[PDB]
Design a protein around this ligand. Structure first.
Ligand SMILES: Cc1c(C(=O)C2=C(O)CCCC2=O)ccc2c1C(=O)N(CCF)CC(=O)N2C
Ligand SMILES: Cc1c(C(=O)C2=C(O)CCCC2=O)ccc2c1C(=O)N(CCF)CC(=O)N2C
Ligand SMILES: [Co+2]
Ligand SMILES: [Co+2]
Lengths: 382, 382
């Protein structure tokens, strides 16, 4: 059931902002590793004396990388005279975030009908404010509320090209990389206590419970917007098991709650994974260890109706996981952590089914692959 | 004249250590951009709860990238029980360095006969101590003194594989990239006042003045070891010109003195620059704008005896600069800044001449290319 209870009009995921030590090196690594083009910038060369911000795009997916300059460059500025293109930015907030958590997501940004209305309604409904609505060049409105840990949910609305004050990137630096990634499918938080986290976020958004489930290290539940195109899963650890909760490991190395993974939809996951895997050892991203051959023998009996033997064999080459609910099928694979700490990682996904356009969450989030990987692993020992 | 006045036995440049926010992303970007292999690591997977350190190598050149973990992982450690593989590391020193300067070189490391002797002699001769000599696994000795700003000169000596506590990297992650770079030729500091800087460093090393020169933004002088294989140029701004001193710009954005550039010798600069330039827009490094065609017409009359028309034409394709002293010829080119701030950059060089082995500094450091670029530029306007 979908009660469609959004307290304001939400459209789609808009962008994800990483807070970095050096935005240049992170953005260049991500561009090559994921196949995203350099599409906009805001930095010293655009008149920004406050922060360096670089935007990568692939299809509709937008990754923003931001780092602070020396505060001395902007010492005479005040907020009414700022050269920052993102008015919520603060040197001290950014250095404290990064010192505490390391490289990770500061902002999960969604496009809404009216960011000022979304902000007021959210705070009137219990959201902790982080940055009030600010109108940029009377064209774009931006506002932020706390989501979990030091992650903010950022609202963006357009009257009628990323943000005012950003410049489109010079074609020579804009190499048109593309490995098939097209949009953000979901963004997942890790918290110490799921119940309060769910109550808080669902409280101020009106997002409804899309899915939920309770030996594998975690309990999880998913919040969704009215058309279930904005999907926000949240996990908590389950203490008292054998192998340690990876959620608990996350919370320890991250210094508390934060964003666990970004799932990126590919229009051709086979091509995406071939391209990403070619680059793993030359600057790109590494993938989690592949499942044993038993996992792929067992796939025939699970998705032989959806995937040819041929296509299953291609999953096995690439290490791709498959899961299925009563409506759709999910192809998924997970990177190793994106940076130094065992905290944030990326998931690549493609969904098959639920055609009407495709409905969001088609096939679920892969919770069946915990048990099926475990079984697959034991069968291969013997 | 070379008075060979080293106060201790110095061998060669050993490594350069970058202090980073996230060592993983910087090291991966540099590996791809410069063609260096992942050759050793010290991190959580090797038992290091303190810092993440990744070593890239190309020939004899060694680049180390280090970032701190959360202090909470090592809260119960003391120095006698530390899991850090580099005992001089300090979480607070590293975060303060990076907050102040951004991405850059913390340590210029030279291999000496005996690091404890080098340290004692250096401090007895005026060096400000930074980290006392520490013996690692009774095999390697490490010590550090202040060089300029927050950059340390690090002494390393071996009894008889990078450092104890580092692990050689698993061949699958060790992709054998190589674009021809072979060793560090020189490492250059920017300071507010050259005189005191020179007196201090030459005071405690016994390094001698190798070169010096005084409209182009700077005054510079070069200190050298006995065999002139360790070369340490130092620049200061010249205030009172037309175009702003790039040294002054460095000091402003870096929050004071620090390392300006690393010059990396290539065994085939043509191949190095072809490989680096292919990767500029796909995660690698950008190069400074190329000189006009006039610069390359003027090359025939300057180095037509050393370089064929053919080889000069290849310099012009690649943007390579050429200079010459009375003993040798220098091919050189400069990257744009390595990170967010207009501070540190890299030079690629190859030297022709001074054969005996090749003597260090053969051809100089390219100071003639300031005037020759300027002239070249005016000739091309008209
Ligand atoms: C994170 C994750 C998901 C996942 O996407 C998901 C959500 O989107 C929301 C519900 C809860 C949840 O976990 C699905 C499978 C999965 C992992 C996983 O993390 N790991 C550990 C590191 F890779 C190991 C592993 O073997 N499997 C199979
Ligand atoms: C740094 C540098 C050197 C250089 O290597 C050197 C030493 O090694 C020690 C003596 C002093 C010194 O400057 C040589 C040429 C040069 C630059 C240069 O910095 N720039 C600005 C940014 F690229 C612009 C430019 O046009 N030319 C031609
Ligand atoms: Co997921
Ligand atoms: Co130089």
């Amino acid at each position: 059931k979908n009660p469609k209870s959004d307290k304001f009009k939400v459209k789609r995921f808009h962008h994800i902002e990483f807070w970095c030590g050096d935005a240049t090196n992170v953005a260049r690594r991500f561009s090559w590793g994921l196949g995203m083009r350099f599409s906009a910038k805001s930095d010293l060369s655009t008149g920004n004396m406050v922060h360096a911000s670089y935007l990568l795009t692939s299809g509709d997916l937008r990754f923003l990388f931001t780092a602070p300059y020396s505060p001395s460059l902007s010492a005479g500025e005040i907020k009414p005279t700022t050269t920052a293109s993102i008015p919520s930015f603060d040197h001290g907030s950014c250095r404290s975030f990064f010192s505490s958590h390391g490289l990770g997501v500061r902002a999960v940004a969604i496009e809404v009908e009216d960011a000022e209305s979304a902000f007021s309604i959210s705070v009137a409904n219990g959201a902790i404010p982080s940055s009030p609505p600010i109108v940029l060049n009377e064209a774009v409105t931006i506002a932020e509320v706390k989501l979990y840990g030091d992650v903010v949910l950022r609202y963006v609305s357009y009257k009628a090209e990323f943000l005012p004050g950003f410049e489109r990137v010079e074609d020579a630096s804009s190499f048109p990389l593309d490995y098939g990634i097209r949009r953000l499918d979901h963004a997942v938080g890790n918290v110490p206590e799921l119940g309060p986290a769910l109550t808080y976020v669902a409280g101020f958004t009106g997002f409804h419970q899309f899915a939920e489930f309770t030996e594998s290290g975690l309990n999880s539940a998913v919040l969704a917007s009215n058309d279930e195109m904005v999907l926000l899963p949240i996990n908590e650890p389950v203490h008292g098991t054998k192998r340690k909760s990876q959620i608990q490991t996350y919370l320890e190395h991250n210094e508390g709650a934060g964003l666990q993974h970004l799932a990126l939809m590919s229009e051709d996951i086979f091509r995406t994974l071939r391209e990403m895997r070619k680059r793993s050892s030359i600057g790109g991203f590494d993938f989690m260890p592949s499942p044993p051959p038993t996992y792929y023998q067992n796939l025939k009996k699970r998705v032989g109706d959806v995937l040819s033997d041929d296509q299953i064999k291609e999953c096995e080459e690439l290490g791709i996981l498959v899961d299925r609910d009563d409506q759709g099928t999910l192809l998924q694979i997970f990177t190793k952590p994106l940076g130094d700490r065992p905290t944030i990682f990326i998931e690549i996904i493609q969904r098959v089914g639920c055609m009407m356009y495709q409905s969001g969450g088609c096939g679920g989030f892969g919770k069946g692959n915990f048990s099926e990987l475990f079984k697959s692993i034991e069968e291969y020992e013997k």
